[PDB]
Amino acid sequence: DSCIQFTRHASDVLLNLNRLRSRDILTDVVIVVSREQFRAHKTVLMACSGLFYSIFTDQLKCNLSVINLDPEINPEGFCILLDFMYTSRLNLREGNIMAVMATAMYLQMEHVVDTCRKFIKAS
Amino acid sequence: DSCIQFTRHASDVLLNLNRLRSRDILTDVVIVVSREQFRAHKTVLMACSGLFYSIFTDQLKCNLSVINLDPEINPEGFCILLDFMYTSRLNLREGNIMAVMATAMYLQMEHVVDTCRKFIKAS
């Protein structure tokens, strides 16, 4: 086509979606990880995760307001990945890299799994 | 912070949100423009438009499944702007630039209004 493109548009959209999340605006699901609860937008979860994409395209699960993750999933690893979904920024540290990689493999977030594998290989 | 960043994350999120829109997955509102109906995600509309942001943060309107725009709004100008919201690509042409600028001013999409003003000034 003969379209023009606004370079910062996608980043600005994501920044505003994170602002809605921080104010709990139009969040439509709560993700339960052990005792911890995380409010989010189903569409953002689907756009970032192969697991949420499969869950919310399912004719029955698409209507659930509460999703319980496998008890092996660490709430801190999930929190770091949820923050990544809404910001593109990953808080990867020596003390969390194993929990982050395991959570990303479960959530099916291929690019996060790839950087965790590379960072582990380096050490 | 000591975060790492995935450069393509925001663009990949937006591409997946557009894929959900094209398949009509988790769309929660229909925008009526004259006779034409457009299905979309409230969160994406809010993230892109000052008008939708005001509408869906309103305690009563946040619950509406149908939003009717002012009858002066052109359905083609709206379609071009809705496509821009989900792709960062604006199909700006000599034959549509006036309708696109008027719709962007109404929707409060400041960056689109700015490029329309510059393109009109050049001609």
Binding site: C3, I4, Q5, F6, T7 | R89, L90, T115
Partner: peptide, 4 residues
């Protein structure tokens, strides 16, 4: 704005 750019030419994509």
């Amino acid at each position: 704005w750019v030419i994509p």
